[PDB]
Design an enzyme around this catalytic site. Structure first.
Site, PDB file in Angstrom:
ATOM      1  N   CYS A 308       0.811  -1.221   0.000  1.00 19.29           N
ATOM      2  CA  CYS A 308       0.000   0.000   0.000  1.00 19.29           C
ATOM      3  C   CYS A 308       0.847   1.276   0.000  1.00 19.29           C
ATOM      4  CB  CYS A 308      -0.882   0.048   1.270  1.00 19.29           C
ATOM      5  SG  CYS A 308      -1.883  -1.514   1.401  1.00 19.29           S
TER       6      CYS A 308
HETATM    7  C1  LIG Z   1      -3.630  -0.996   1.094  1.00 20.31           C
HETATM    8  C2  LIG Z   1      -3.660   0.190   0.123  1.00 20.31           C
HETATM    9  N1  LIG Z   1      -3.354  -0.066  -1.170  1.00 20.31           N
HETATM   10  N2  LIG Z   1      -3.934   1.419   0.583  1.00 20.31           N
HETATM   11  C3  LIG Z   1      -4.150   1.784   1.995  1.00 20.31           C
HETATM   12  C4  LIG Z   1      -4.686   3.209   2.047  1.00 20.31           C
HETATM   13  C5  LIG Z   1      -5.010   3.528   3.508  1.00 20.31           C
HETATM   14  C6  LIG Z   1      -5.643   4.913   3.655  1.00 20.31           C
HETATM   15  N3  LIG Z   1      -5.968   5.163   5.077  1.00 20.31           N
HETATM   16  C7  LIG Z   1      -6.590   6.280   5.498  1.00 20.31           C
HETATM   17  O1  LIG Z   1      -7.051   7.110   4.718  1.00 20.31           O
HETATM   18  C8  LIG Z   1      -6.732   6.433   6.899  1.00 20.31           C
HETATM   19  C9  LIG Z   1      -6.613   7.717   7.452  1.00 20.31           C
HETATM   20  C10 LIG Z   1      -6.674   7.913   8.843  1.00 20.31           C
HETATM   21  C11 LIG Z   1      -6.861   6.798   9.693  1.00 20.31           C
HETATM   22  C12 LIG Z   1      -6.985   5.509   9.160  1.00 20.31           C
HETATM   23  C13 LIG Z   1      -6.915   5.328   7.768  1.00 20.31           C
HETATM   24  C14 LIG Z   1      -6.827   5.109   2.725  1.00 20.31           C
HETATM   25  N4  LIG Z   1      -7.916   4.425   3.045  1.00 20.31           N
HETATM   26  O2  LIG Z   1      -6.728   5.833   1.725  1.00 20.31           O
END
Ligand SMILES: *CC(=N)NCCC[C@H](NC(=O)c1ccccc1)C(N)=O
Ligand code: NA
Ligand code: NA
EC number: 3.5.3.-
Length: 420
Positions: A308
């Site tokens: 990720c």
């Molecule tokens: C696994 C992958 N390809 N991407 C992971 C992206 C994680 C990201 N997380 C958040 O936005 C987030 C912000 C604050 C707290 C918890 C998660 C996303 N979902 O874009």
């Protein structure tokens, strides 16, 4: 802002993560440990995204202090909102016989600097960029390199003003996807990204997350493994389905394949980590499997780990071998292979060879393939008897110094067939 363009001149072929990579993209402020950057920079070009010259200098100081191989460190100066380079950086595809292009899309997060980044990536690399008007995210995308792509259902629901047919047609036009395999996400999380539960390890291998029998997602993941096990892969055989057991939400499928190395996030316990690393070692003979501990400030999560926070960068001068192997029981009487070899570097190709071994005895022998027409090579196995077992792989080289095999890893994992 996102700029829609016409799609690339065909045929189009999206590049898989296990094809040659010229670099890996990461971003500062960091979401990954320095030890990972050091490991990556030993053998690969690491391109770090920074917002300014001052940030570039700060990062070089940190890399110098940590013993990172600076001779493999490059930088792109561009504003970004996050370190999830997997999700917002462009997608690579070959087009117009021997060109490498970048496909931009509408990033599915409210992150305008991240969304804009592919334009600066294409300019940095010297390749053309095509604007596919779909709301997408790289974490929810994987391709086998043969026109198949797996995505969770958000590829449809986040493009709900378009029909499924139109969404499939855009993937076909911009990435050459003939099988847009959109599935219901089995992981039970908010994110709905394929990389948290599934990963193509090769055109014929897929890794699917496994959880204990009492976990609420046990059956959904078992159903997903059965779904791929029944499918015919690009090479004509049923997929080899591997399982990585997550006893406690460990993101074992969230790895990065970078050339001949695989970086697997590990977060314990040691025995469960080692079991997952052993799955990769069994599935991927010849690859260096590396367990990577998380950074304490930004630990690995079940919905967000190493894959990720990285994105492989294709070789703009890629020496590409296109081959559909002859596998398993071959009726004969002829045992003929064909490969198309193109140089995106417009380099002179020579030699093109078939390395083979009969009845697993002695060493692999090399034979020159015949160029029948420009870019089209053939080879016939002669003097083979009933029940002879053949191991073979393709090898090509060009005058730019590129050397490639098919399969990518070459000799440690050859194509196997038996003479009938
Ligand atoms: C696994 C992958 N390809 N991407 C992971 C992206 C994680 C990201 N997380 C958040 O936005 C987030 C912000 C604050 C707290 C918890 C998660 C996303 N979902 O874009
Ligand atoms: Na930010
Ligand atoms: Na974008």
């Amino acid at each position: 802002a996102f700029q829609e363009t016409n799609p690339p001149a065909g045929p189009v072929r999206a590049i898989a993560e296990y094809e040659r990579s010229a670099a890996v993209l990461v971003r500062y402020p960091f979401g990954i440990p320095m030890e990972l950057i050091k490991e990556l920079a030993k053998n690969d070009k690491v391109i770090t995204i920074v917002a300014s010259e001052s940030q570039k200098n700060t990062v070089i100081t940190q890399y110098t202090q940590s013993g990172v191989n600076l001779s493999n460190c490059d930088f792109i100066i561009a504003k970004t909102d996050s370190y999830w380079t997997r999700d917002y950086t462009g997608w690579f595809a070959m087009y117009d016989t021997n060109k490498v292009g970048l496909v931009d899309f509408i990033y599915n997060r409210p992150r305008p600097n991240d969304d804009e980044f592919p334009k600066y990536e294409a300019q940095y690399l010297g390749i053309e960029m095509f604007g596919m008007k779909l709301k997408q995210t790289g974490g929810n995308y994987m391709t086998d390199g043969y026109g198949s792509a797996v995505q969770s259902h958000i590829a449809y629901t986040e493009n709900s003003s378009l029909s499924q047919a139109q969404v499939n047609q855009k993937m076909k036009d911009y990435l050459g996807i003939t099988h847009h395999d959109v599935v219901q996400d089995p992981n039970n999380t908010y994110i709905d990204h394929v990389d948290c539960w599934g990963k193509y390890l090769a055109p014929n291998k897929i890794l699917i997350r496994k959880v204990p029998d009492n976990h609420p997602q046990h059956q959904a993941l078992e159903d997903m493994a059965a779904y791929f096990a029944a499918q015919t892969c690009a090479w004509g055989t049923k997929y080899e389905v591997y399982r990585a057991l997550a006893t406690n939400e460990q993101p074992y499928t969230n790895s990065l394949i970078l050339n001949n190395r695989v970086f697997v996030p590990v977060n314990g316990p040691a025995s469960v980590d080692n079991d997952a690393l052993n799955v990769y070692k069994t599935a991927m003979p010849g690859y260096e499997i590396i367990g990577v501990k998380g950074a304490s400030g930004t630990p690995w999560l079940g919905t967000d780990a190493l894959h990720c926070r990285t994105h492989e960068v294709a070789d703009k001068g890629y020496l590409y071998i296109k081959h559909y192997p002859i596998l398993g029981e071959q009726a004969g009487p002829d045992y003929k292979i064909e490969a198309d070899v193109v140089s995106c570097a417009n380099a002179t190709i020579s030699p093109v060879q078939c390395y083979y071994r009969i009845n697993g005895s002695g060493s692999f022998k090399a034979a020159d393939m015949t160029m029948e027409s420009t870019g089209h090579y053939t080879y016939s196995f002669t003097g083979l008897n009933k029940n002879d077992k053949v191991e073979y792989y393709i090898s090509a080289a060009d005058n730019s110094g590129r050397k490639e095999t098919y399969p990518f890893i070459g000799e440690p994992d050859p194509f196997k067939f038996t003479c009938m």
